[PDB]
Write a protein that binds this ligand. Structure first.
Ligand SMILES: O=C(O)c1cc(=O)[nH]c(=O)[nH]1
Ligand SMILES: O=C(O)c1cc(=O)[nH]c(=O)[nH]1
Lengths: 213, 207
């Protein structure tokens, strides 16, 4: 993996976003690890998070005109990623996010920020079943914009309800590329680096054997 | 004024956040100027916005444990302010925001002395609702920080900021005030007509 990807795993572990134990996922599966991006819940965590998103985005080489974050979890992510693109990559990008219902006052509709136009980069944390993307895609399409990509923190690389993963479902359903800062493959690689992580390594590898794509 | 205040006025003008013309405010008053923080809508705008909020916060000296932004406008403001505190002031603050439709909170636990951040205060509705939430969690209100204090009357004798300050015994601070805007416009010969209109508005509605 690239250095920033190893650093991102180290960051997620340090802020207790990446945890090990016995978790029940939205699907009902029992997983030995869980990535709870909601625990990036301080200003330093947000600052670094945006920097890691921005690095992954620039690394991908995908061209885009605007960053969109879905209400609610996407709003801080899009904000900090936009800041980091300006502060650390000499890129001053429009951002946008939605409100779940229109205000009484004014004609802003359901959008906040810049006009929703051009090639949109959608930011998200972890795709489980694609619902936040679906709501977002309906908004992107209704505004005449296109989806340049979806940028997420972690691709768990595991089956959805059927044969393909949730990320592969989004890629097919919305005909797009999903960019991830890290994957399950990267997590497994990181866990090979120190003997203290060997129990977690075995558990995560067993999970991949059962559910990985 | 302080350098960050002059720079914030210049920046707001350059991004059309501060604009002149004829606007109808939430109060129905016809104002010759309007401050729309929602037009700080690019990454550079957001980066600098948070710096300006962070500078006003540290300048105030108010002690606080957590930054809260009311949904929706306060969410990006609190986010970028928290980023700038960490990146430019070596201060790593918990942040929080609510879901407007109303569990109802995102971010760090709502505890301790909370600094609210908002764009403007018109009637005090976002603060009233946010204060309900903050006090219901046992937290206290360290302050409210806004971009611009328009220094105008509310429905009665006092301003909406003064209502907030008294109703909640809390401190409201602002990056800039109308008095700062007037001081700046007095320096710019090309803004003389705008200045006159703003001064006439202040004569009618100023507190
Ligand atoms: O429910 C899941 O599958 C899930 C959600 C989430 O936020 N993080 C994770 O690692 N899995
Ligand atoms: O009074 C208002 O409605 C108001 C004034 C202003 O300058 N900005 C804003 O957002 N609202």
């Amino acid at each position: 993996m690239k250095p920033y990807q190893r650093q991102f795993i180290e960051f997620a572990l340090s802020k207790q976003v990446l945890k090990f134990g016995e978790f029940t996922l939205k699907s009902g599966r029992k997983s030995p690890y869980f990535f709870n991006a909601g625990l990036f819940n301080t200003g330093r965590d947000l600052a670094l998070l945006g920097r890691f998103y921005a690095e992954a985005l620039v690394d991908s080489g995908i061209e885009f005109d605007l960053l969109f974050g879905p209400a609610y979890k996407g709003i801080p992510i899009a904000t900090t990623t936009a800041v980091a693109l300006a502060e650390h990559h000499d890129l001053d990008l429009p951002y946008c996010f939605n409100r779940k219902e229109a205000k009484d006052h004014g004609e802003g509709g359901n959008l906040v920020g810049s006009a929703l136009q051009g090639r949109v980069m959608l930011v998200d944390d972890v795709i489980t079943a694609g619902t936040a993307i679906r709501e977002s895609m309906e908004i992107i399409q209704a505004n005449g914009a296109t989806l340049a990509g979806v940028l997420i923190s972690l691709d768990r690389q595991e089956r959805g309800r059927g044969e393909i993963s949730a990320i592969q479902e989004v890629e097919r359903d919305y005909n797009c590329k999903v960019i991830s800062i890290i994957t399950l493959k990267d997590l497994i690689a990181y866990l090979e680096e120190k003997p203290e992580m060997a129990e977690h390594l075995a558990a995560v590898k067993a999970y991949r054997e059962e559910f990985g794509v």
